[PDB]
Each structure stands twice: as C-alpha cells, then as structure tokens.
Design a binder for this molecule. Structure first.
Ligand code: U0V
Length: 460
C-alpha cells in the first residue's frame, strides 16, 4: 500500500450564531452553494482530512462530533477518526481523518490564545491544531477576531497576538512562530473584517449582491485592503472570492441581509461583509492548490453562512536510509555562498544565524556576520563564505530536494531573533551555485531580507 504524495484537505468555518445546526449540513462538506464549488462527480470521494472551525458554537464537543461524523458517514460511507478537538469558550476546532491515515498522523498539538485585556478579554481568540502527516507538518488555526466595522486595527492586533502566542508544532523551532513551523498552515475563522462603505449605501450594497456584482464591494473589503497594505496576514494566500457576503443574514432564510442598528447590535450597523474566511501559507515550492472556496446556501440557522475551502496539498514520506535517521549521510551537503541579511533595525549589535531543518540532526549556529551601512540607511550583515557547511541526515535527492531550511538572524547581545525566513531546497540544479532569497519577518511583520547563493550536493 503506497504512501501518498498528495492529500486533499477540507477547511470549514462557520459562526453558528449560538443556535443549533439544522438536521442536514452535508452541502458544507460537499463544497456546494455559491462561489468556487466542487464537481458533483466527486461527491462520494472523501477528503483525507476535514478541519472544522466554529465560532459562537452552542454545542458540547460530543454533540458536534456526533453531527460531524454522521454527516461524513452519510456522504462517504467512511467512519472518520477524531484526530483532535479543542474549544476555547464558544470557538472550536475539530480535525477528522480517514481511518487509513491513523498511523500516518503523529505529534498532535492543540493550543488556544485569548485576545484583548479586561473589557476585551473573555470571548475572542483562537484555537489551533498541528500534527505531522508522514514527513509533512500541518497547522490549522480557527480565530474569532474582534467585531465591528471601525475595529480593523484591533483585528490586526488580534492576528499578531495569535501568531505570537499560539504554541503549536515543534517546540525545538524556538525562534519561529506558527507562520514558519509548518509545511502548510491554514488560518480561517470569523475574522470579522467588513466592507468599508458608508452606512447610507446599505441598500445599494444589497442591490449589488442581488446582481452578483461583487467587484465594487471586494475593493472595500478590509481584509483585502489591509493585506495589500501589509498590515496583516503577510505572505498568506486567499482564493478569489466569488460568493456573496456571508454576514449578516436574517435567520431561517438567505433572502435578507439584516444590517440596521439595533439594541442587540450595540446600535452598530452590520453592512453585508465577508467575515468568514480561509487563508493559507505553505513553504516555498510545495504543491498547494485551492480546489473550492465558497459558501452554502441551504444552512440558515445562523446569521452567518458556512464557508468551505478545499485544497490539494503535497506531502512527503517518512524517509529511512541505511544512514539517517540516527547519523549523517556524508554524500550530502548544503553550502551558502555570498550571503547577506538586510535588516530594518536601528540597533548595532553583532548578528549570527541559526539554520533549522528536520533534514539536520539539530540546528546549526553560524559565526557572527560583518555589519556594514547600506546606501539608503539600512543595516547589511555580510556572512560571505563564512557559513557552516550543513550536513543532512539523508543525501538521497528524492528526499533532500523536498526539504526546507528555516533561517533566524539573532542578536549576539540578547540572542533574540530579529528575523525569520525559509529557503526551499527544490533547486533547478545540484552541485551548482544558485540564487536564494527569503523575506525576513518577526512577529509576522517584515524586518528584512536574506539573499545569497546555495550549492546543494546530493548522492546523485
Ligand atoms: O448517497 C449518498 N451516499 C452514498 C455514498 C457512496 C459511497 C461510495 N459509493 C457509492 C455511494 C448520499 C450523499 C449525500 C447526501 C446523502 C446521501 F445519502
């Protein structure tokens, strides 16, 4: 029975509005409704992994797991295994997988982050799950961010707190936050970003939605504009939105948007918005293809519609050789030539690098670089040909070309990371000097760049 090199992943996000679901929710898992929908010919094909994020979820874990498992068994005739379930308040994440994957899944982690302080601490935040699927690390975040059209900067702050403090994946990757710990990271939820148009334009917006003309609405979507201005979700992807706004509906129909201010809303308007989203970030040159992104039309118990997204995701096998794991493969090496970091910092400490990868027995510390002043004010840290030769555990090119090197640049004075990035070993050539590049981030914000050349020696 061969190990897969691709799997499909279902991501669902649904703000349930504190109401129990209707009896049938299969359209959600089938990716049927509005937007980029799944072909009918695939309906009986199970996804490998189903990740379900809810917000305002009124159910117990047991109650929701029974509904989800029943739903999937009715669609696929497969009894899914529960990988993980984690709840913070009324924010929940469930991960289900086909039974054949039970012995491919390991290192399961869960965590939550509570956002805000005092007044603003007690219902918003995030839950997450991570695990290994054979040689591939997968992370999943379900966040419920701050509500309200005039709180976009609070949402951006909520995002940065969640990616700083959510403790998932390999704790040995100590310089790295969740935006660097996984081959594939999916981040979804009621992100609560709104269409920023005047209140007076509510009926005009509704008109546009009825005509399926989303362009003049999407150009005002706060998440798209904040992402274009590099305020949030830097280096994440989102499929094009081709479904109507998923909030705020009158319950028990989808015929009406309920936008007007009420005591129940704190006298706030809720103009139709794409609150409910799925984004992802995968390591460079790993296969990831969105195959659906849409909303259901037939699940109407909440003031939000459920959102679905599905992905093809490249995965690798748990590689064994005669040598590694448990020794090096002297036939393998990674060399960095002519490397330098450009940093936005005003500080003047010496810096060193750390190289982290599951292709190394443990992380590698460089010598300090040589600081120069850049033309336009910047700090340039030169490593030249000084970087330590990296010794992978396995030299087979079928393994090594699929790996990645995480890089942290750290202050000699504080040992704190000033920037983190990732280099793919999926090179055009081996035994050949080739350009490499990553942006560097810290707390998910841009802090610099790392560029140079690589020379990769494999057993071939
Ligand atoms: O017909 C259904 N599921 C049978 C699954 C099946 C699997 C493999 N080969 C043939 C058929 C069904 C689908 C959606 C909703 C409700 C249903 F009852």
């Amino acid at each position: 029975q061969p190990e897969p090199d691709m799997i499909t992943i279902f991501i669902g996000t649904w703000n349930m509005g504190n109401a129990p679901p209707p009896k049938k929710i299969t359209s959600w898992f089938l990716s049927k409704g509005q937007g980029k929908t799944r072909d009918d010919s695939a309906d009986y094909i199970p996804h490998d992994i189903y990740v379900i994020g809810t917000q305002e979820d009124p159910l117990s874990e047991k109650e929701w797991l029974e509904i989800l498992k029943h739903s999937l068994q009715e669609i696929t005739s497969v009894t899914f295994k529960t990988v993980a379930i984690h709840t913070l308040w009324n924010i929940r994440i469930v991960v289900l997988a086909k039974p054949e994957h039970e012995n491919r899944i390991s290192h399961i982690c869960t965590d939550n982050v509570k956002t805000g302080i005092a007044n603003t601490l007690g219902n918003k935040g995030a839950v997450g799950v991570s695990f290994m699927f054979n040689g591939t690390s997968l992370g999943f975040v379900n966040s419920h961010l701050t509500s309200g059209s005039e709180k976009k900067l609070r949402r951006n702050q909520n995002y940065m707190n969640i990616l700083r403090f959510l403790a998932l994946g390999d704790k040995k990757l100590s310089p790295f936050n969740i935006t660097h710990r996984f081959t594939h990271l999916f981040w979804f939820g009621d992100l609560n970003y709104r269409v920023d148009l005047p209140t007076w334009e509510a009926e005009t917006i509704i008109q546009k939605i009825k005509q399926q003309q989303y362009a003049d609405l999407l150009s005002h979507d706060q998440l798209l504009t904040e992402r274009r201005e590099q305020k949030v979700f830097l280096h994440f992807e989102e499929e094009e939105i081709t479904f109507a706004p998923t909030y705020r509906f009158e319950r028990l129909t989808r015929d009406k948007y309920a936008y007007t201010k009420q005591k129940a809303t704190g006298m706030k308007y809720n103009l139709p918005s794409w609150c409910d989203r799925v984004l992802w970030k995968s390591y460079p040159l790993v296969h990831v293809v969105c195959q659906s992104y849409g909303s259901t039309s037939d699940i109407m118990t909440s003031d939000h519609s459920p959102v679905f997204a599905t992905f093809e995701a490249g995965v690798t096998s748990q590689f064994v050789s005669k040598n590694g794991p448990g020794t090096v493969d002297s036939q393998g090496q990674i060399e960095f030539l002519r490397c330098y970091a450009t940093l936005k910092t005003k500080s003047q400490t010496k810096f060193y690098l750390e190289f982290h990868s599951s292709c190394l027995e443990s992380f590698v510390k460089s010598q300090e670089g040589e600081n120069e002043e850049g033309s336009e004010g910047e700090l340039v840290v030169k490593f030249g040909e000084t970087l330590p030769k990296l010794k992978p555990i396995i030299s087979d090119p079928e393994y090594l070309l699929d790996q990645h090197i995480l890089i942290s640049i750290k202050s000699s004075d504080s040992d704190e990371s000033y920037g983190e990035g990732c280099i793919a070993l999926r090179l055009e050539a081996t035994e050949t000097q080739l350009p490499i590049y990553t942006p560097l981030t810290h707390h998910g914000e841009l802090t610099g760049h790392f560029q140079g050349e690589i020379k990769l020696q494999t057993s071939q």
